[PDB]
Write a protein that binds this ligand. Sequence first.
Ligand SMILES: CN1C(=O)CCc2cc(CNC(C)(C)[C@@H](O)c3ccccc3)ccc21
Ligand SMILES: CN1C(=O)CCc2cc(CNC(C)(C)[C@@H](O)c3ccccc3)ccc21
Lengths: 166, 166
Amino acid sequence: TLGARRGLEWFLGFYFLSHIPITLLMDLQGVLPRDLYPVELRNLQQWYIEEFKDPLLQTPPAWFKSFLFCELVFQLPFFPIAAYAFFKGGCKWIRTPAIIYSVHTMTTLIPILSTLLLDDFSKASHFRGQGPKTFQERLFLISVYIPYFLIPLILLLFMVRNPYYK
Amino acid sequence: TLGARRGLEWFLGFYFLSHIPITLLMDLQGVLPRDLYPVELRNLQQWYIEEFKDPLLQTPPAWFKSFLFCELVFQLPFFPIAAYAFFKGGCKWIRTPAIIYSVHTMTTLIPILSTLLLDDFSKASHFRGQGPKTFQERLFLISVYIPYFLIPLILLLFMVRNPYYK
Ligand SMILES: CN1C(=O)CCc2cc(CNC(C)(C)[C@@H](O)c3ccccc3)ccc21
Ligand SMILES: CN1C(=O)CCc2cc(CNC(C)(C)[C@@H](O)c3ccccc3)ccc21
């Protein structure tokens, strides 16, 4: 019926397929001009920031804004290519690019997860009137970012050791 | 003669070999306790911080702190292995590990160079007056950080298309 490799390849395909509208309509809002987005999407973003108390996409710091520029220039063009390769199967040429994407995305989230878990978001910090204050709110926000470190990690382990992609 | 390929392997070897003392004696002073270093080395880092106006090494922010731990846990054990492989040459088993190191090293410096070049280090910022203000001071600091982005960039492109490592 279905194999364990092929089933993961379908999971990787939808992960890249869903990342295209998620990046365009949500994450790149902190870098791209606001007038590119309708009023409905701009308030949709504020719903997420107010519900999850996200302080990075709200006012992007210089280090976090540099990562968003990487997501537009390097990751976003790679998402449709990776979605096709893992949906069709047998595309061995995606091996090295997928490894490059996985290590790059895993490295971007390490400072993000570390910032949300340990930093203070009250006054006397650059973030003002924003950020999680309790341990529950910090974990509630980390769970939203944590798939973009685990799934690239799974892809990295999958691409390195799979004899079919080597 | 020698050959640009072999010479690059010789250049890569000295890059990883010299990276061990640089990481152990200078870079990790922000995450390791100050007591571990003698007084001369502590003040030698004080010389670099005061002359170069380095705003990230003395009081490392959380995002920069997580990268220093990645330099200690992941990069430093890899430096002797890669130095031996490139001094000897023709080690096919270094291709995938070197690609992972390169992308990881390029990704950690994009926010670093961006902060040094564009961020605000005035006395009213959370950097508390420590940091470059003029364009020449920013480039003096970028000049010492930039080799660790270009050399991994050369390594990444080298491993991807070199047949002797496939
Ligand atoms: C800069 N960057 C990257 O370079 C790697 C991918 C990434 C990922 C993210 C996380 N994106 C959120 C949490 C917004 C996403 O999960 C979401 C979207 C809609 C509803 C709920 C959650 C934020 C930034 C980046
Ligand atoms: C976290 N990380 C990495 O993951 C890659 C290597 C790296 C490199 C650096 C930059 N290290 C300095 C600027 C300190 C070094 O060039 C130096 C040493 C002695 C005298 C002058 C300059 C800072 C952070 C990282």
